[PDB]
Design a protein around this ligand. Structure first.
Ligand SMILES: CCC(=O)NCCn1cc(CNCc2ccc(Nc3ncc(Cl)c(Nc4ccccc4C(=O)NC)n3)cc2)nn1
Ligand SMILES: CCC(=O)NCCn1cc(CNCc2ccc(Nc3ncc(Cl)c(Nc4ccccc4C(=O)NC)n3)cc2)nn1
Lengths: 254, 259
């Protein structure tokens, strides 16, 4: 059972914008458990059941999952105003965190974030779940050494087959994670900046790729470029990525 | 008419101060309605008949407008203590918002704000109403994707925002509103930095008359900066109207959403 009652949720400051409406922080006063910081996803346009089905469906998707690097669903209030209650990652969105802390972060913290995301995506691939939107913008920071995937067309992240044929598989999630890994190494800079979405598939199809970020280890960039094989069958799986990222990370810390 | 039963208002945290006194947020449970979050203007010296007339007249000014990006009058309490009850913009003032979320707002959101404000100003122009106090300071945030012109009385010399003809000749028209709007767009894209910071006001008219303009903010689209410079034509008859501004802003926005 996931129904929380409005009275155990204490609405706080707005912390950002979500796909459906403003996200707030708050406090969930469980009768059983010590009060906890929460993020409260709110919905505007939730009046029409049509969008409600889309808003509440993310909750039902996320209650499937239990992983230390996937934001945890705490519960839902399904009477209007409809809220989704999630755990709070207190250090905010990853893109902002990377931009604001650009000169206080060391390379191996960046590789660690990429490693932890690979453990969430290997977990997802083990459930045969395809996420479809792996990007730094869908990651939150729970601690300076702990990141969590959230958010259950972004042309500049998408695999060729996704743009061309709307095909979304474990291999196209691998493509996007490659882009995300690049974003982290670029301290939150978006891929293909100053390029129109319209010219993305054409340059991708002609073999253009994101360059190697400054100070990105050459072996880590080789990992990104394997994620960007045009042929989806030539791309690694997330267990391979996770293993290699552990090696690049252990070495980086020495 | 706009009278509201004080038993229906619970006063809340203070959110600022106007020339008549503290502004609070609060709760209003209207008959045939549920709870409502509201902003409450209070008047310190309402006992003076003249002050009360000026104060209440600020509510009449807002009563005449009905627009999604202008704060709405909810009602007035005319017995002492005299209050004005406004719609609440829960995220507060734009400049603070812009400063705090600087590394979180997409440029698309920055342009959306400018577009939404041009929509309110086009509406005001459609009523032949001249605002005269257009500034990021006077823009409120209802949501991360919705800003509103704040209370016109709370909006209030603002030399660094004013058109030259308003400085030199106290002329205020829709064209001078368009000048101030360009400054407000520059504030937005500068994340709440004030224009002409560290410059004396007497120096500002000299630079403007000399042809100096505010610089293109970092990461601002040239097309958008060029829109700003059109609003800062020294000659008021060369400034676009808000309908043009709004239409060009919707193109600029669509260009950002196509990256
Ligand atoms: C320091 C220098 C400096 O300049 N600081 C700037 C001043 N500042 C700091 C802050 C911090 N607040 C931002 C924040 C954002 C998220 C969380 N945690 C959080 N936790 C769980 C969720 Cl589910 C969530 N969701 C989301 C919330 C918003 C947007 C997207 C999602 C989402 O779901 N994305 C996939 N957010 C906690 C805080 N604000 N202004
Ligand atoms: C003295 C020492 C000291 O520490 N003081 C601290 C006092 N403090 C608190 C804050 C935080 N502000 C939060 C805020 C601001 C606005 C709204 N929402 C809101 N909604 C509707 C209206 Cl109509 C409105 N009106 C206005 C209200 C205030 C100012 C201008 C207008 C206006 O209409 N302008 C054109 N404001 C909601 C929250 N900053 N300072």
């Amino acid at each position: 059972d996931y129904e929380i009652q409005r009275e155990r949720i204490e609405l706080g400051r707005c912390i950002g914008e979500g796909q459906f409406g403003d996200v707030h922080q708050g406090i969930y006063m469980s009768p059983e458990n010590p009060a906890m910081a929460v993020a409260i996803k709110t919905c505007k346009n939730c009046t029409s059941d049509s969008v409600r089905e889309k808003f509440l469906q993310e909750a039902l998707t996320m209650r499937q999952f239990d992983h230390p690097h996937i934001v945890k669903l705490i519960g839902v209030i399904t009477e209007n105003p409809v809220w989704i209650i999630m755990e709070l990652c207190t250090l905010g969105e990853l893109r902002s965190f990377l931009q604001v802390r650009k000169f206080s972060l060391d390379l191996a913290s960046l590789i660690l974030y990429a490693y932890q995301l690979s453990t969430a995506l290997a977990y997802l691939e083990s459930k045969r779940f395809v996420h479809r939107d792996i990007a730094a913008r869908n990651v939150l920071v729970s601690a300076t050494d702990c990141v969590k995937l959230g958010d259950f067309l972004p042309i500049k992240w998408m695999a060729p087959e996704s743009i061309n044929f709307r095909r979304f598989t474990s291999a196209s999630d691998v493509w996007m994670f490659g882009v995300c890994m690049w974003e982290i190494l670029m301290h939150g800079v978006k891929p293909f900046q100053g390029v129109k979405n319209n010219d993305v598939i054409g340059r991708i199809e002609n073999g253009e790729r994101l360059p190697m970020p400054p100070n990105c280890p050459p072996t880590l960039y080789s990992l990104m470029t394997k994620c960007w094989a045009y042929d989806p069958s030539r791309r690694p799986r997330f267990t391979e990525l996770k293993a290699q990222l552990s090696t690049i990370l252990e070495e980086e810390k020495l």
